[PDB]
Structures are given as structure tokens and as C-alpha cells.
Amino acid sequence: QSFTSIARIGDYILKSPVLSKLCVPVANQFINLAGYKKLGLKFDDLIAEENPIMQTALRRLPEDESYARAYRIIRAHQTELTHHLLPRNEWIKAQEDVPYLLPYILEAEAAAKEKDELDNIEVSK
Amino acid sequence: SSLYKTFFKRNAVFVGTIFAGAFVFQTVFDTAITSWYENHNKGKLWKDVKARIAA
Amino acid sequence: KSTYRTPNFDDVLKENNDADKGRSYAYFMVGAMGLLSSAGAKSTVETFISSMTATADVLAMA
Amino acid sequence: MAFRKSNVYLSLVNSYIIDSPQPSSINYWWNMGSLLGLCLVIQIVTGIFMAMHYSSNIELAFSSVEHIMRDVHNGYILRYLHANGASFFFMVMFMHMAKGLYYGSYRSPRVTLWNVGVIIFTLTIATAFLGYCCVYGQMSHWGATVITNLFSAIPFVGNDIVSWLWGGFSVSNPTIQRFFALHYLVPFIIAAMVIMHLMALHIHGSSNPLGITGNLDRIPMHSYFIFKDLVTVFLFMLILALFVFYSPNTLGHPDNYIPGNPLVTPASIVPEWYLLPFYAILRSIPDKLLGVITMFAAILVLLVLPFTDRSVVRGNTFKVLSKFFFFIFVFNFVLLGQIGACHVEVPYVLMGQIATFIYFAYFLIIVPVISTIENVLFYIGRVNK
Amino acid sequence: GPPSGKTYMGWWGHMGGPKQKGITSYAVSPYAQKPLQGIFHNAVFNSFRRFKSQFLYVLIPAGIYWYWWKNGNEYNEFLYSKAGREELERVNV
Amino acid sequence: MTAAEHGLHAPAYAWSHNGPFETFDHASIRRGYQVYREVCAACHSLDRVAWRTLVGVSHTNEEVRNMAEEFEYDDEPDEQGNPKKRPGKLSDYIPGPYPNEQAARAANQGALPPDLSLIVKARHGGCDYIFSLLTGYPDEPPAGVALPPGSNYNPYFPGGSIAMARVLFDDMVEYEDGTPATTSQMAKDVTTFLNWCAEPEHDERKRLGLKTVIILSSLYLLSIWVKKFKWAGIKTRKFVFNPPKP
Ligand code: HEM
Ligand code: HEM
Ligand code: HEM
Ligand SMILES: COc1c(O)c(C)c(C/C=C(\C)CC/C=C(\C)CC/C=C(/C)CC/C=C(\C)CC/C=C(\C)CCC=C(C)C)c(O)c1OC
Ligand SMILES: C/C=C(C)/C=C/C=C/C(OC)[C@@H](C)[C@H](OC)[C@@H](C)CCc1oc2c(O)c(OC)cc(OC)c2c(=O)c1C
Ligand SMILES: CCCCCCCCCCCO[C@@H]1O[C@H](CO)[C@@H](O[C@H]2O[C@H](CO)[C@@H](O)[C@H](O)[C@H]2O)[C@H](O)[C@H]1O
Numbered sequence: 001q002s003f004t005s006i007a008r009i010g011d012y013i014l015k016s017p018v019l020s021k022l023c024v025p026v027a028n029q030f031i032n033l034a035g036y037k038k039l040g041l042k043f044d045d046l047i048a049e050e051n052p053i054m055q056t057a058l059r060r061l062p063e064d065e066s067y068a069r070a071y072r073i074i075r076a077h078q079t080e081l082t083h084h085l086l087p088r089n090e091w092i093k094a095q096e097d098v099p100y101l102l103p104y105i106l107e108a109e110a111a112a113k114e115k116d117e118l119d120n121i122e123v124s125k
Numbered sequence: 126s127s128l129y130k131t132f133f134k135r136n137a138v139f140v141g142t143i144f145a146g147a148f149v150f151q152t153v154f155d156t157a158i159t160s161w162y163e164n165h166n167k168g169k170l171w172k173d174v175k176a177r178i179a180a
Numbered sequence: 181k182s183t184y185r186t187p188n189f190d191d192v193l194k195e196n197n198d199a200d201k202g203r204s205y206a207y208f209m210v211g212a213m214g215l216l217s218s219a220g221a222k223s224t225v226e227t228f229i230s231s232m233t234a235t236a237d238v239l240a241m242a
Numbered sequence: 243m244a245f246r247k248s249n250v251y252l253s254l255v256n257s258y259i260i261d262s263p264q265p266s267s268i269n270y271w272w273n274m275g276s277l278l279g280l281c282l283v284i285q286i287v288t289g290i291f292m293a294m295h296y297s298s299n300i301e302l303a304f305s306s307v308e309h310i311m312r313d314v315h316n317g318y319i320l321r322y323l324h325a326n327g328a329s330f331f332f333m334v335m336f337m338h339m340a341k342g343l344y345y346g347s348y349r350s351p352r353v354t355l356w357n358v359g360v361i362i363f364t365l366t367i368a369t370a371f372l373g374y375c376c377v378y379g380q381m382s383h384w385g386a387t388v389i390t391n392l393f394s395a396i397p398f399v400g401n402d403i404v405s406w407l408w409g410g411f412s413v414s415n416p417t418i419q420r421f422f423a424l425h426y427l428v429p430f431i432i433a434a435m436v437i438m439h440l441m442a443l444h445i446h447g448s449s450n451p452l453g454i455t456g457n458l459d460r461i462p463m464h465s466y467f468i469f470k471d472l473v474t475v476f477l478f479m480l481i482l483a484l485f486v487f488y489s490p491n492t493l494g495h496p497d498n499y500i501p502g503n504p505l506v507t508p509a510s511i512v513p514e515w516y517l518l519p520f521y522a523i524l525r526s527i528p529d530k531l532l533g534v535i536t537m538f539a540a541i542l543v544l545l546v547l548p549f550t551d552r553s554v555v556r557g558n559t560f561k562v563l564s565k566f567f568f569f570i571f572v573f574n575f576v577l578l579g580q581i582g583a584c585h586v587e588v589p590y591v592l593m594g595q596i597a598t599f600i601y602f603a604y605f606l607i608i609v610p611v612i613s614t615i616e617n618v619l620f621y622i623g624r625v626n627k
Numbered sequence: 628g629p630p631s632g633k634t635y636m637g638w639w640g641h642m643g644g645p646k647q648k649g650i651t652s653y654a655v656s657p658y659a660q661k662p663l664q665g666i667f668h669n670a671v672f673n674s675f676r677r678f679k680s681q682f683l684y685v686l687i688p689a690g691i692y693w694y695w696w697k698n699g700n701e702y703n704e705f706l707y708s709k710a711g712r713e714e715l716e717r718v719n720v
Numbered sequence: 721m722t723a724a725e726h727g728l729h730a731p732a733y734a735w736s737h738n739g740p741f742e743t744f745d746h747a748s749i750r751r752g753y754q755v756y757r758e759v760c761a762a763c764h765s766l767d768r769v770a771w772r773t774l775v776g777v778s779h780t781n782e783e784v785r786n787m788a789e790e791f792e793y794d795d796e797p798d799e800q801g802n803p804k805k806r807p808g809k810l811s812d813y814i815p816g817p818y819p820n821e822q823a824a825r826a827a828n829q830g831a832l833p834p835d836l837s838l839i840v841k842a843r844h845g846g847c848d849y850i851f852s853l854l855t856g857y858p859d860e861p862p863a864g865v866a867l868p869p870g871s872n873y874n875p876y877f878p879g880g881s882i883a884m885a886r887v888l889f890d891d892m893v894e895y896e897d898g899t900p901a902t903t904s905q906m907a908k909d910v911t912t913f914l915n916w917c918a919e920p921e922h923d924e925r926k927r928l929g930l931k932t933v934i935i936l937s938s939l940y941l942l943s944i945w946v947k948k949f950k951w952a953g954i955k956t957r958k959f960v961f962n963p964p965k966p
Contacts, residue, residue, distance in 0.1 A: 001552040001617050010621040027623035030616075034560040035680070039452075043620055048556045049455055050351050050446075050635045058645065064963065067649050071961040074458050074650060077267040080451060082955055083677055097624050129204035138211035147218040154219075154931065162927050166743040169736065171776055174746045177897070180780070181960055183651050191669070192956045194661035205662045206949050213942045220935055227316045231291050235313040237770065240811045263639065266954065308768055308838075311921075318921045319928075351635055447636040457636065457644030461954060469947045476940040483936055487929025488740055491841060499842035499918075500834075509878070510844075565681075569688040577692055585721055588706060588718055589699035649964045657952035663945055707722050 003105045004113075037092040038085040039076040044101040045069055053112065057104040065100055258444065262463040265456025268448060271345075273474040274338035280475060281331040282436065286429050288324040289373075292317075296376070298422040300415040303378035304501045322490040323482075328370050329493045330482050332516035335363065339544075344568055346556035347449050348547045355442040360544050362435050365428060367517070372425035374498075374514065378418060381495050383502030384511055386413045386421065395534045412504065453557030518582030519575055523601065525586065526594040536598070543605050550605055553613035554620075563612045571604045727878040730845040730852040733908075737915065741930070743923040744916055750778040751895055752913020755906045758893050760836070763828065763884075765816025768837035769917050772810040777916065784810060791815050829870040831883035840911070840918040847911050852876045854907040857886035 013019040031037075036046060047054060061069070079086055163170060194201060246256045295314050297306040310317040339359070342348055348356035375386040390407045394400040409416030450456050485492065493515060497508050513521045524537035558564040574597050581594040637643040705711040706718070736745045753774070756766070771788045775781045788808035793815070795806035808815075816835075818824035825832055834842075843849050853876045861873035861880075871881045888903040895901050916922065 001554060001614060003554070006554070006617045006621050009618050010625060011627075013618070013622055014625065014627065023619075024622055027619045027621075030562055030619045031623040033562045034620075036560045043624060046452075046454060046555045046560060048349065048453070048554065063966070066645050067647070067964055068961075070458055070645055070647050071650050071959070073454060075959055075961075076452060076454075077265070077450070077456075077459050078957060078959060081267045084673065094624075099621075099624060102625075126201070126204045126208070129208055130200060133207065133211075135200050135203060137207045138214065140214075143211065143214045143218055146215050147222065150215060151219050151222065158931050158934075159927065162741070162743075162930065165741055169743050169745040169747075171746045171778070174750060174778075175780070177747075178780075180783070181962060183960070183962070187653055187958045187960065189653075189655050189956065189958075192655065192660050192665075192952075194659070196659075202658050202660060202662045202949075206658070206946075209942055209945045209949070213939065213946055216935055216939050216942070220939070227319060228287070228291055230315045231317060231320060232294065233315055235295070235309075235315070236772075237309070237313040237811070261639065263636070263642065305768075312768070312773075318925065445632075445634045445636070455635075455644065457642045458647065460639075460642060465950055466954070469943070469950050473940070473943045473947050476936060476943050480933065480936040480940055483929065483932045487925055487932060496842050496844055499838045562684075565684040566688065569685050570691075573688050573692040577696060580696060587703055587721065588715075589702045593695070593699050649962050651960050651962070652957060653960075654953045654957045657949050660952050660956070663948050666948075 002109055003102065004109050007102075007106065031097075035085075037097060039079055040072055040086050040090060040092060041076050042072065042092055042097050042100065044099055045072055045076075047101065047105075053105060053108050056108040057101055060104045060108075061101065258440065258463075259468070260462065260464040262444075263447065263456075263460035264463055264467055265448060265450035266459045266461050267450045267452060267456075268467075269451055270470075270474065271337075271341040271451075272448060273471055274334055274341060276471045277334045277474060277478055278331070278338060279436065280478070281327060281334060282429070282433065284323065284327045285331065286433075288320050288327065289426070289429070292320050292324060293426065296422070298376070298419045300378060300418045303376060303418055303422075307377050318490075319486065322486045324373075326482060326485045326490065326493060328373065329514075329516065330478070330485075331366070332370075334478075335366065336516075339363070340572065343547075343571075344558050345449055345451065346453055346551065346553075346558070348544075349551065349556050350548065351446050352442070352449065353548045355439065355446075356548065357545060358435060358439045358442060360541070362432060362439060363544075364541060365432050365435065369425065369428040369432065370514070370516075372421050372428065375418060375421045376425060377498055378502050379498030380500045380502055380508050381498040381511065381514075383413055383504065384507050385513070386417060390417075392534050395531045449556065451557070451559055453555055453559060512583060515579070515583075518580075519578035520582075522578045522582035522594050523598050525582070526591070526598045540598075540601060543602060546605050547609070550610045551613055552610050552617065554617055561616055563616055564609075567604070567608050567612060570600070574600045574604075724880050725878060727880070728852075728856075728875040730848040730876055732848055733851060735847055735912070737912070737922070740926060743926070745912060746778060747897065748909050748912040749916050751897065751899065751906075752909040752911070752916075753778055754896065755893055755910040756836075756913060759887055759906075760910065762817055763824075763833040765818070765833075765835045766814045766837055766917060767816060767835050769814045770810075771808065771812055771814065773920060775810070777920075778913075788812060829883065833884070836914055836917065838918045840915045842918075847915055849876065850911045850914060851907050853882075854886075854888055854911070855904050 013023050031043075036043065049055065049058060058066070075086075163172075167173065246252045246260060292310055295306065295310050295317070297303060307321065310321055312318075314320070342356065342359070371385065371389060375382045390404055390413065393403045393407065396403060405411070407417075408414070409420060447456065495512060495514070497510055500508075520537055520540060523540050524533045527533040527536050553561070553564075555561075558568055578594065578597050578601065581590055581597060584590045635643060706715045736742060736748070756764075771784050774784045774787075779787075788810060791808040791812075792805045793808050793812055795804050798804055818827065821832065840846050840850060845852070853874060856876045857872065857874050861867050865873060865880065867873055867881060871883060872885045873880050874882045888906050890903055891901050893901045893906060899905065919925075
């Protein structure tokens with residue numbers, strides 16, 4: 001499933017006050033139960049990267065965020081191997097759990113989709 | 126443990142000594158187990174039954 | 181933080197009064213594992229090798 | 243450079259077992275693969291030594307195995323290792339597969355790795371069936387009869403395939419002799435498939451419990467995982483030993499201690515335990531053709547997972563709904579097995595049909611629906627607009 | 628040698644990860660560490676934690692299936708007893 | 721399925737050979753053989769058991785030789801080609817009562833007494849089953865049971881209708897060692913003997929298991945320790961991040 005598609009559905013829910021008040025609280029609880037924040041990770045650090053879109057995206061990420069992602073990932077592996085969680089004061093707070101890679105991913109998917117469209121454009125005379 | 130440093134002195138045990146100890150272990154261990162086993166089953170063994178027989 | 185200030189390892193480090201404490205234990209464990217393995221391997225090899233010796237039913241005294 | 247790297251043969255050993263970069267965080271669930279290689283070795287070695295005393299003729303097969311049990315020095319150890327080892331081979335394979343299922347190991351870029359694994363699984367099941375027939379007990383004869391008949395469901399040529407497989411009018415001498423020859427062959431084809439499996443594994447390396455990249459922190463296979471593998475190798479041997487020496491027939495069927503009889507099928511006939519879930523699936527379809535098709539599909543559906551898993555993250559570690567349904571799947575599988583061991587009676591027949599549905603629904607419906615929902619939940623729980 | 632296809636894993640020195648900077652690691656020889664005996668008092672209450680979060684995901688589906696199994700079994704037992712031979716003829720064929 | 725069709729579940733008797741450290745009781749094996757010879761052997765073969773296996777287990781080398789010689793076996797034809805018999809030797813297998821299947825069915829109302837060499841392993845329940853069957857014949861079948869002619873009732877046999885009638889009765893055998901030959905005593909003995917027939921490696925197998933399990937257990941505990949040591953540097957490793965300036 002593409003991020004463009006997840007965004008389409010997600011935004012439709014976020015805009016409608018009917019669904020927005022019904023779903024978000026559920027989603028918030030789902031995220032806390034997931035537990036990735038206790039390992040010092042942000043959701044975007046969890047996205048499977050072995051594909052061209054994600055490689056393009058990670059390539060375009062500014063230096064500072066790149067070094068940061070690297071530390072979080074390494075710190076998560078070490079904690080996981082010790083079978084512990086980080087001290088609560090080190091957990092990622094909801095304010096920090098921002099979709100920092102999302103804009104780069106969406107941009108790359110759009111660029112990719114356009115190429116696919118243009119490579120297959122029909123012509124009418 | 127200083128007991129180790131008397132025989133091997135901070136160095137690991139070498140293959141030759143390991144192999145040598147293995148041959149020793151095999152014999153000792155087998156007798157120890159067979160003894161316990163036969164004793165635990167005293168009365169049920171054929172050795173015991175043959176003693177109660179005379180022909 | 182300064183890289184020259186090494187983090188705390190006190191909870192892991194042994195109060196060094198007996199320098200070769202961990203070494204003697206590790207080497208005894210490694211040595212004992214090597215001993216029991218060699219005896220096990222020998223027994224396993226002999227088990228398989230002996231299965232090829234004359235079977236109980238073919239040792240007929242003619 | 244070091245000799246282990248320069249030599250043509252040793253470099254293979256070095257790249258696969260010594261310097262191979264492993265993700266620092268893999269847990270004991272990643273020890274199953276080595277255990278499978280060990281199982282393959284135990285089956286091959288014990289089988290070759292027994293082959294030395296085995297006669298495949300239908301008149302001598304059963305007695306030749308009794309001869310191995312009674313007259314061959316340590317013969318009972320070889321046979322019990324082989325028989326119990328086959329069972330242990332399946333227990334470990336299910337765990338290896340379940341691990342893959344849970345951690346998204348079947349996902350890109352490891353699809354090829356997963357597909358080769360499915361082939362190995364099919365071959366292993368076929369190999370065990372061929373071996374089981376070699377004993378020529380009651381379960382051997384009827385197992386050979388029922389399973390070769392699976393092919394009669396093929397329209398037009400089905401009965402011809404069966405007579406060809408049998409080498410005659412029914413399961414007879416030609417059948418058992420060819421099944422022994424084939425039982426000896428397949429393990430070597432499995433060995434070749436394992437190499438292809440390791441080749442695909444090598445190009446991308448192992449995955450890890452977090453489901454993310456392992457490229458930022460690797461540690462050499464040698465020392466760390468060699469000794470970590472040793473821990474489970476001994477635990478595996480200890481347990482196998484408890485069965486081989488203390489309870490050698492608990493995982494088998496008493497009817498296989500009765501020579502095969504072409505005129506009588508025991509009322510107590512039950513398939514080998516590792517085949518029960520599949521057996522139950524087939525039994526749940528009251529149609530011959532559809533029964534065998536659905537059963538085979540239960541294995542092939544494993545190939546669909548890379549496409550039906552819609553998630554954007556690999557693995558179930560941080561997925562509440564997926565973890566829950568994964569365990570629904572596992573216990574549903576155990577139920578299928580318990581149903582297979584039961585009589586074709588009222589409550590059981592319906593339960594088996596529902597469990598069969600749940601089995602297929604997991605791959606085709608639950609995973610794609612749930613993974614899509616989880617994708618969206620992850621998004622709206624953090625985007626503020 | 629022959630050209631090799633691009634993968635997502637390299638080897639020591641070119642693993643394929645992003646460029647690392649700013650991270651400093653520290654470690655101490657296993658030889659200098661307290662011999663295996665400290666995994667208690669400090670590492671005991673901490674343990675068992677990685678199953679307190681997981682047991683529900685295992686237990687609930689297990690419970691559902693054990694109950695379902697018990698129920699069907701007890702029903703089968705009833706059907707084949709004297710008391711249930713009437714119901715048996717009804718639900719059977 | 722109905723209880724009658726399933727058969728009565730055999731209870732768990734306290735066999736002296738039950739338990740990881742327990743060998744067979746060889747005196748019971750010795751007695752069991754007598755019960756087999758004097759009662760069972762009239763209808764049941766024991767094809768997989770060779771005379772020599774008795775030596776050192778339940779009888780002496782001399783006793784077995786005498787027993788084997790009481791039977792005649794086909795020998796190699798003479799100088800002229802005509803067939804000839806020969807007394808039994810230790811290499812021979814205990815002979816059966818019938819020459820072929822057809823002769824066995826004729827002597828048992830058309831039923832076929834199975835060979836007992838593996839009977840203990842070829843039935844769910846093992847010793848408990850065999851014993852219970854032999855001592856479980858009621859004087860009269862439960863009310864309502866229409867038992868076919870030539871059949872017998874036994875609750876432990878699936879379907880309740882068995883072609884073998886009760887054959888064990890008090891004092892029908894005179895035990896060489898003076899033991900009171902009650903039916904339950906004789907049943908206990910043949911069953912023990914039959915378990916040995918099916919599992920002759922029993923005593924030795926458990927002895928080897930004891931050594932195997934001790935070595936493997938130690939190796940297991942030892943590997944855990946070695947692994948923890950080899951991993952201590954990685955497990956206690958610590959990281960620090962200092963964000964690089966632009
Ligand atoms: C992964 C490979 C193998 C598996 C899973 C396997 C499995 C089995 C199984 C299930 C049986 C019946 C066990 C029983 O007695 O109840 C069997 C029997 C047999 N196997 Fe294998 N086998 C394998 C490899 C081999 C190989 C390479 C040989 C070599 C000739 C072999 C030779 C035999 C023989 C001789 C028998 C009959 C003796 C016996 O019943 O144990 N097997 N095998
Ligand atoms: C004889 C059978 C097999 C052998 C010897 C074998 C061996 C291995 C080995 C050594 C590994 C690496 C360590 C590990 O992850 O455990 C591995 C990984 C893997 N195997 Fe197998 N395997 C076998 C069968 C299968 C089967 C039946 C499947 C699936 C149907 C499969 C799927 C996988 C996958 C997907 C991985 C990658 C796991 C990951 O890194 O997350 N294998 N196997
Ligand atoms: C104490 C001595 C005996 C022992 C230990 C014994 C044991 C057994 C056992 C275990 C069975 C198998 C039952 C089953 O299928 O579960 C059996 C069947 C049978 N026995 Fe015996 N038996 C004894 C004496 C006799 C004698 C003397 C005769 C012949 C008069 C006899 C005739 C039969 C027949 C005809 C069957 C077939 C049962 C059927 O198919 O319904 N048995 N016996
Ligand atoms: C990146 O991930 C990895 C990884 O790559 C590797 C390699 C391992 C380590 C595990 C393995 C390499 C397992 C490999 C196993 C095999 C290839 C087994 C292949 C099978 C065989 C049966 C070999 C063939 C054997 C024979 C011909 C010998 C049998 C016959 C004999 C001895 C003759 C007997 C006769 C007489 C007369 C004496 C991992 O654990 C791992 O993850 C942690
Ligand atoms: C030359 C090689 C040939 C011809 C055949 C190899 C290929 C066949 C298989 O897969 C590879 C096959 C084993 C199948 O796989 C779908 C298994 C799940 C089998 C499942 C299976 O087992 C049974 C069994 O074991 C029995 O024993 C007593 C009895 C049985 O009925 C009562 C069955 C049975 O009804 C089924 C479906
Ligand atoms: C697969 C069949 C099983 C076969 C047997 C199993 C292998 C047993 C190996 C036994 C001994 O092997 C032995 O290992 C120790 C290390 O542990 C080696 O020791 C070497 O390393 C240690 C540790 O840094 C040093 O102290 C020592 O001075 C050095 O010589 C020793 O020289 C070698 O001889």
C-alpha cells in the first residue's frame with residue numbers, strides 16, 4: 001500500500017468531525033500499545049526501506065535528521081538485544097513522533113506515478 | 126579460583142589434555158553409572174535371579 | 181557530552197582484587213565443554229561404527 | 243589477506259559462517275535454521291547406516307526393520323533416532339516457518355528465499371511419506387494406498403498415473419521397492435535446495451525482530467552466533483534424547499508394529515501427527531476432487547503472503563491487531579490437527595470446516611484487511627491536519 | 628569477476644547503511660567483567676517483563692480455542708451416551 | 721463414538737519396569753515364559769524371538785539348549801538329496817503351533833491368533849491393556865448384550881466381542897520358584913515377558929539414556945555460560961550521541 005493511499009484515507013477521516021472524533025482516540029491507543037516509542041523510535045523509523053521509493057526518500061533527507069535516524073535505530077537494536085526498554089525519560093514523546101520522512105516519500109511517489117503515466121500516455125488524432 | 130592457576134596457569138586447556146581427559150572420563154563415568162544402575166535395580170537383575178537358582 | 185568521559189560500567193565491572201577471576205572461570209567452562217564434547221563425539225562415532233560389526237544373528241558356531 | 247579469505251573453498255566457509263555480518267539483535271527464533279541443517283544431517287547419516295541392513299522386498303521389509311531393532315548393534319538407537327528425528331524435523335520446520343510469518347521474513351527482498359522454503363517443505367513432506375512406507379506396517383500400506391490415490395482425482399489420466407506409481411494393480415512389491423529408492427534420493431535434492439535457500443539468504447542477509455534495517459550495526463557470525471547456536475543445538479539434542487531413550491514410540495502409531503495387510507484397513511488408522519492439519523482440511527470437503535485440491539491449496543497459499551500483506555512495515559512486533567490474529571492462526575492450526583485426530587462425527591465435522599475457512603481467510607482476507615487498517619491507524623494517530 | 632546485481636546489504640566497510648557521524652560507542656572486555664553470577668538481584672524482577680505485555684495476545688486466542696475444543700468434545704460425549712441417543716438421531720444424518 | 725465400540729480404558733498398574741531408572745524384573749520374565757509355554761503357545765506363535773536371546777535374560781545357556789532341542793526343525797538334505805529333520809539349536813526361532821494361517825483359523829472358529837512378539841507395542845495401552853484384557857473376562861456379559869455364537873465378552877476389547885475365551889484360571893500352572901499361580905499373577909508375568917519380547921533392549925536402552933541425558937544436560941548448562949561470557953562485551957555496550965554541527 002502506497003503512502004499516497006494511506007494519506008488519502010487518513011486525511012478524509014481527519015477532516016470529517018464525525019470520524020475524526022471516533023477514530024483518532026482509537027489510533028492514539030493503538031500507537032501506545034505498539035510500543036515502538038519505548039525503544040526510542042519514531043514511526044517513520046519503522047518503514048521498510050528496501051525499495052526505490054524509500055531509498056530516494058532517505059537520500060533526500062537532510063544530514064541532521066539522517067544522523068538522528070541512525071542513532072535511534074542503533075539505540076533500538078542495542079536495547080532490543082538486552083531485552084529491556086529505555087528509561088521512561090528517554091522514550092519518544094508524542095510531540096516528537098512526527099512524520100519527518102513522509103513528505104519526501106509522498107514527493108517521490110508522485111514523481112514515480114507521473115513517469116509511469118507519461119511512459120504510457122496514449123495519443124488521439 | 127586459584128585452583129585453576131595451579132594446573133593451567135591463566136592459559137586455556139589445550140586439545141591434547143582435553144582429549145586425554147576424555148578417554149579417562151569415558152571409562153570412569155561408565156563404571157559409576159553402571160554401578161548405580163545395577164544397585165538401584167537390585168533383586169530384579171538376572172544376576173540376582175541366577176543366585177536364587179541351582180541346577 | 182565529552183567523549184573523554186567514559187560512561188558508568190560499575191554495575192558490570194568486578195571489583196578487581198582477583199585479576200584472573202573471570203578468566204579462570206571462563207577457561208574452566210570452555211575446557212569442560214571441550215572435554216564432554218570430545219567424549220560425546222567419540223561415543224557417537226563408536227555407536228555408528230559398531231552398527232557395522234557382525235550382527236547378533238550371524239555369529240553361528242558351526 | 244588471511245588464508246580463510248584467499249582460498250577458493252575456505253572463502254565460502256568464511257563468507258557464510260565466519261565473517262557473515264549478522265544484525266546484532268536477532269533472537270533465539272533465528273536459531274531454527276541451523277537446527278534444520280542439523281536435522282537433515284541426522285536423517286541422512288542414520289538412514290544410510292540403516293540402509294546397510296534394510297531389504298525393500300515387500301516380503302522382507304517389515305522383518306528387516308525388526309532385524310535392525312533386534313540384531314544390529316545399536317540398531318534400535320539408529321531407528322529411533324531416525325523416526326523421532328523426522329518428527330523433530332517437522333516441529334522445528336513449523337517454528338522456522340511461524341517465525342517467518344510473524345516477522346515478515348517472506349517480504350521483499352526475501353520473496354525468493356520464502357518461495358524456495360515452500361518447495362523444501364513440500365519435498366520434506368514427500369520424503370517422510372516415502373520413508374514411512376518403507377517400514378511396511380499397517381499404516382505404511384494404507385498411507386501409501388491413500389496418498390498415491392490422491393492422483394486419481396486428476397481427470398482422464400488420474401487412474402493411469404496411479405497404476406504407473408504402483409507398478410501394478412495395487413500397492414505391492416514394485417511399489418515398496420521404488421519408494422525406498424526414491425526415499426534415498428529426495429534427501430539429496432533437499433540438500434541442493436537448502437544450498438539455493440542459503441544463496442538467497444546470503445545476498446540480503448537475515449532480517450531482525452524490529453523489522454527494520456540491520457545495516458547500521460552488524461556483528462560477525464563467528465563466535466557470537468556460532469556459540470549462541472551451540473546453546474540450542476544441545477537443548478535440541480537433550481530433548482531428542484529423552485524421546486529416543488525414554489519414550490521412543492510416543493510420537494508414532496501402534497498399528498505400524500503390525501505387518502501390512504492388503505485385505506484389512508484398521509479402524510484405528512490415523513495419519514502421522516505432522517500431517518494431521520492437512521488431513522483435516524481434506525476431510526472437511528465432502529467431494530473427492532475438491533478435497534484434494536483444497537488440501538494442496540492449503541500449502542500453496544503460503545506463496546500469496548508477500549502480496550496480501552499490505553503493511554508498510556515488516557513484521558508484527560509493533561502491531562496489536564496483527565499479533566492477535568497471528569495467534570488466532572497458530573491455535574487454529576493446532577485445532578485442525580486435533581480435528582484430524584478425531585472421528586468423522588457431528589461436532590467435529592463442522593468445527594473442521596470452520597477452522598478450514600479460518601485457515602484460508604487468514605491469508606486472503608484477514609491479513610490484507612488488518613494490515614490496511616493498521617497502516618491508516620499509524621497515520622491518523624500522529625498527523626495533525 | 629562477473630558483474631553482481633545490486634542488493635540491500637554490502638560487506639564490512641560498505642554495509643550499505645547511511646553515513647554515521649556523532650555516535651560514539653564504548654565497551655569493556657568480558658574478561659574484566661564480573662563472572663556470571665550477577666544475573667540475579669539486579670536481573671530477575673526486571674525479567675519476565677517481556678511476556679507480561681505479550682501473554683494476552685497468546686492467552687486470549689488460546690482461551691477461545693481451548694473453550695471451543697472442550698465444548699465440542701463434551702457435546703460429542705453426550706451424543707454417544709444413552710441420554711443423547713435421541714438427539715444423536717436428530718443431528719446425525 | 722459409543723463406549724462399547726471404543727472399549728473400556730485400561731487403568732494404570734504399578735509395573736516394576738515403569739520409571740526412567742527401572743529395569744525389567746527378570747524373575748517375572750522367567751515365570752512369564754512358563755505361562756507362555758504352558759498356556760498361550762497352543763494358539764500363539766512368537767516368530768521374532770530366537771532361543772539365544774533368552775540366555776542371560778531369563779534362563780541359563782544350558783536351560784535354553786534343552787528347550788530348543790525339544791523341537792525339530794528342517795535340516796539340509798542328505799548326501800542323496802532326501803529331506804531330513806534336526807533338533808533345535810540356539811540360532812533358531814521359537815516355533816509356532818500352526819504350519820500356516822489356514823490351519824490356525826481352522827483351529828479357532830475362523831479367527832487368527834496374532835503373533836505376540838510385538839503385541840505390547842502394537843496396541844494402545846501396552847502392558848496395562850494386555851493385562852486388563854486377560855483378567856477382564858466377566859462371568860456373564862452385561863444385560864442386553866447379544867453375544868454372537870463362538871464369541872466372548874471382554875469390556876477392554878473394542879466392540880466387546882472377542883474370539884479368545886478366558887484361558888487363565890487359578891493354579892493352572894505350577895511355578896518353578898514356588899510362587900502362587902493366581903490368574904492376576906500369571907497375567908502379570910506373561911505380560912512382563914511379552915514386553916521383553918517386544919522390547920529386548922529395554923534395560924540397556926535406559927542405562928544408555930541415563931549417561932546420554934547427563935552429558936547433554938551438562939553440555940547445555942555449560943554452553944549457556946560460555947555464550948553469556950562471549951556476549952558480555954556486546955550486551956553491556958553503551959552508546960552516546962552528540963549531534964554534529966553543520
Ligand atoms: C530428511 C530426510 C529424511 C527424512 C525426513 C526421513 C524420514 C523417514 C521416516 C518418517 C521413516 C519412517 C520412520 C519409522 O520407522 O517410523 C523413514 C524410514 C527409513 N529411512 Fe528415512 N528419512 C530421511 C532420509 C533418509 C535417507 C537419506 C536414507 C538413506 C537410505 C533413509 C533410509 C530410511 C530407511 C532405511 C528407513 C526404514 C527404517 C525405519 O523405519 O526407520 N532415510 N525415514
Ligand atoms: C531443511 C529446511 C530448511 C533449512 C536448512 C533452512 C535454513 C535456514 C537458515 C540457516 C536460515 C537463517 C537463520 C534463521 O533465520 O533461522 C534461514 C532463513 C530463512 N528461511 Fe529457512 N530453512 C529451511 C526451510 C525453510 C522453510 C520451509 C521456509 C519457509 C516456508 C523457510 C524460510 C526462511 C526465511 C523466510 C528465512 C529468513 C528469515 C529472516 O531472516 O527473517 N526456510 N533458513
Ligand atoms: C496367557 C496366554 C495368552 C495370551 C498372553 C494371549 C494374548 C492375546 C492377545 C493380547 C490377543 C490380541 C487381542 C487384541 O487384538 O487386542 C489375543 C488374541 C487371540 N487369542 Fe490369545 N492369548 C493367550 C492364550 C490364548 C489361547 C490358549 C488361545 C487359543 C485357544 C488363544 C486364542 C486367541 C484368539 C483366537 C485370538 C483372536 C481374538 C480376536 O481376533 O477376536 N489365546 N490373545
Ligand atoms: C545469515 O544467516 C545465517 C547463515 O548464513 C548461516 C550459514 C548460518 C549457519 C547455519 C548453517 C550453515 C546450516 C547449514 C547446513 C547444511 C548446508 C546441511 C546440508 C546437508 C547435508 C546432509 C550434507 C551432506 C552430507 C554427507 C554426504 C555425509 C553423510 C555420509 C557419511 C558420513 C558417510 C557414511 C558412511 C561410511 C561407510 C562411514 C546461520 O545460522 C545464519 O543465521 C543465524
Ligand atoms: C513418489 C511420491 C509420491 C507418489 C507422493 C508424494 C506426495 C504426496 C504428499 O505431499 C507431498 C502427501 C504426503 C500430502 O501432501 C498434500 C500429505 C499432506 C498427506 C496427507 C494425508 O496423509 C495420510 C496418511 O499419512 C495416512 O497414513 C495412515 C492415512 C491417510 O488417510 C487416512 C492420509 C490422508 O488422507 C492424507 C490427506
Ligand atoms: C566436533 C567434534 C568435537 C571435537 C572436540 C571439540 C574441540 C575441543 C578443543 C579443545 C582445546 O582447544 C584449545 O582451545 C584453547 C582455547 O579455548 C586454545 O588456547 C589458545 O587460546 C587460549 C585463549 O585465548 C589461550 O589462553 C591459549 O594460550 C591459546 O593457546 C588451545 O591452544 C587449544 O588447543
